[PDB]
Amino acid sequence: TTTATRLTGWGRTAPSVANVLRTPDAEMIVKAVARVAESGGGRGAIARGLGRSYGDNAQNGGGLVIDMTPLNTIHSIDADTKLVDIDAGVNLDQLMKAALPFGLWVPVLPGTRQVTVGGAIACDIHGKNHHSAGSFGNHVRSMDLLTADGEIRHLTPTGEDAELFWATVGGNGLTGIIMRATIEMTPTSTAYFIADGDVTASLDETIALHSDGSEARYTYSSAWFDAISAPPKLGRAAVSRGRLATVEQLPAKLRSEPLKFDANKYTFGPIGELWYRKSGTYRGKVQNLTQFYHGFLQYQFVIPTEAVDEFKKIIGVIQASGHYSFLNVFKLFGPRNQAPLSFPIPGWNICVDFPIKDGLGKFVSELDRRVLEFGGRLYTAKDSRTTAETFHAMYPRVDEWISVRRKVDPLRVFASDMARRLELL
Numbered sequence: 001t002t003t004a005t006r007l008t009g010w011g012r013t014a015p016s017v018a019n020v021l022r023t024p025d026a027e028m029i030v031k032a033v034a035r036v037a038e039s040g041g042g043r044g045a046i047a048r049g050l051g052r053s054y055g056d057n058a059q060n061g062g063g064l065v066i067d068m069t070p071l072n073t074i075h076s077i078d079a080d081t082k083l084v085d086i087d088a089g090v091n092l093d094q095l096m097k098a099a100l101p102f103g104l105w106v107p108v109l110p111g112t113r114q115v116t117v118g119g120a121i122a123c124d125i126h127g128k129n130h131h132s133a134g135s136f137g138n139h140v141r142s143m144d145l146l147t148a149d150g151e152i153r154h155l156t157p158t159g160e161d162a163e164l165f166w167a168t169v170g171g172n173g174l175t176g177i178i179m180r181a182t183i184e185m186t187p188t189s190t191a192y193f194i195a196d197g198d199v200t201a202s203l204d205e206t207i208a209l210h211s212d213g214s215e216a217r218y219t220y221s222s223a224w225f226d227a228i229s230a231p232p233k234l235g236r237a238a239v240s241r242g243r244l245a246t247v248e249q250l251p252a253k254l255r256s257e258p259l260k261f262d263a264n265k266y267t268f269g270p271i272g273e274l275w276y277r278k279s280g281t282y283r284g285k286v287q288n289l290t291q292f293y294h295g296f297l298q299y300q301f302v303i304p305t306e307a308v309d310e311f312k313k314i315i316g317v318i319q320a321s322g323h324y325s326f327l328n329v330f331k332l333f334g335p336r337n338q339a340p341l342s343f344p345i346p347g348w349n350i351c352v353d354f355p356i357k358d359g360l361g362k363f364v365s366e367l368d369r370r371v372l373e374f375g376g377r378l379y380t381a382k383d384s385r386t387t388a389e390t391f392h393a394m395y396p397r398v399d400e401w402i403s404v405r406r407k408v409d410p411l412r413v414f415a416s417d418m419a420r421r422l423e424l425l
């Protein structure tokens with residue numbers, strides 16, 4: 001039934017061999033968990049989605065990995081209740097396509113739509129709209145969770161079982177296997193955005209633009225960030241902010257199908273600086289999703305809002321480090337949710353991408369130290385190399401979480417490389 005496969009995260013690193021069960025049959029999945037649970041705990045099992053996490057959370061060296069992607073049935077979409085009832089293996093692209101004709105919008109979209117609902121819940125994913133909509137877990141109204149004892153529990157965010165619900169959110173598959181879930185969607189009259197763009201000249205401007213109160217006028221907001229240039233150019237950004245369009249705001253050419261989907265010699269001189277300011281500055285531009293969205297070590301952290309000087313310092317440490325990240329996504333996160341292991345907290349969030357090079361491993365450890373000291377944290381979906389000590393200090397509700405985890409899996413039936421590395425087992 002199960003194939004001995006060699007798995008990595010998206011980052012393609014720290015590989016381990018696991019037995020991969022790949023079946024559309026939910027009964028064969030309940031029975032595999034039943035089959036891991038009688039052998040004491042062994043090296044346990046972990047669910048896997050589309051494998052878009054960069055780290056080691058969806059692999060289990062010498063254990064069972066359950067590929068959930070065949071479980072990809074959309075059960076119902078209701079435009080009156082805004083509810084979708086889907087298998088955990090459906091991905092967000094599939095869901096977005098299916099839901100559009102109902103005037104329904106996926107409430108949190110990450111950078112790639114090739115992620116499963118299970119992965120979205122287990123990493124409590126965030127998107128361009130976090131400050132206004134929170135993260136993925138905020139919009140789950142129920143889920144069905146295959147736990148260690150082979151029973152399927154029906155969890156809701158409030159009432160009985162809320163605790164296990166909120167431990168599952170952001171729990172990296174370590175509470176069991178999400179089989180099915182109900183998501184509340186965001187109503188929309190169009191598949192379009194109305195976007196405003198701005199280009200800042202420095203880090204100070206970027207931060208200033210995100211604290212001048214303008215952010216409250218936008219539901220969606222993110223920025224491409226300069227992390228290579230020396231000050232004052234360091235931290236200059238192309239900001240893209242917006243909100244879903246209404247049909248009255250579409251041009252006539254689009255208004256009849258409102259929900260349908262489908263370096264020269266100047267470049268680094270003053271004419272290019274002008275061109276790029278001009279091209280990046282705009283108001284009320286109508287965009288579809290693709291236009292509005294757009295050997296390596298991926299690293300993402302958030303620093304709490306107040307610690308602005310500390311955030312500025314970390315960015316300085318980054319550019320003077322001799323490690324050059326060209327692709328950097330910046331955003332200001334809004335209020336957190338009640339999940340103990342949820343990554344997002346209100347504050348300055350950035351994702352960087354370092355070429356793998358001599359000194360890099362030791363430099364990001366130092367980064368960890370700084371991020372930790374400044375009260376922020378790393379994102380498990382990007383990580384495969386931080387220590388359990390650092391992680392546990394970054395997430396002070398980890399003991400709270402672990403304690404919930406030991407109630408629901410005393411025999412450690414669910415386990416992964418990440419769980420063992422970060423001592424979440």
Ligand SMILES: Cc1cc2nc3c(=O)[nH]c(=O)nc-3n(C[C@H](O)[C@H](O)[C@H](O)COP(=O)(O)OP(=O)(O)OC[C@H]3O[C@@H](n4cnc5c(N)ncnc54)[C@H](O)[C@@H]3O)c2cc1C
Nearest residue numbers: 049050051052053057111116118119122125126172173178
């Ligand atoms: C190009 C790119 C851009 C990205 N942008 C963003 C972004 O903007 N915001 C953001 O928050 N993230 C982003 N991510 C990270 C990604 O959204 C998460 O890593 C997500 O969890 C991946 O989903 P997956 O289905 O691929 O799950 P996998 O990577 O296969 O697994 C991820 C985790 O979820 C658990 N899991 C999966 N299915 C289940 C299940 N059925 N039951 C229980 N647990 C399960 C796994 O055990 C594992 O712990 C990005 C990733 C990439 C590659």
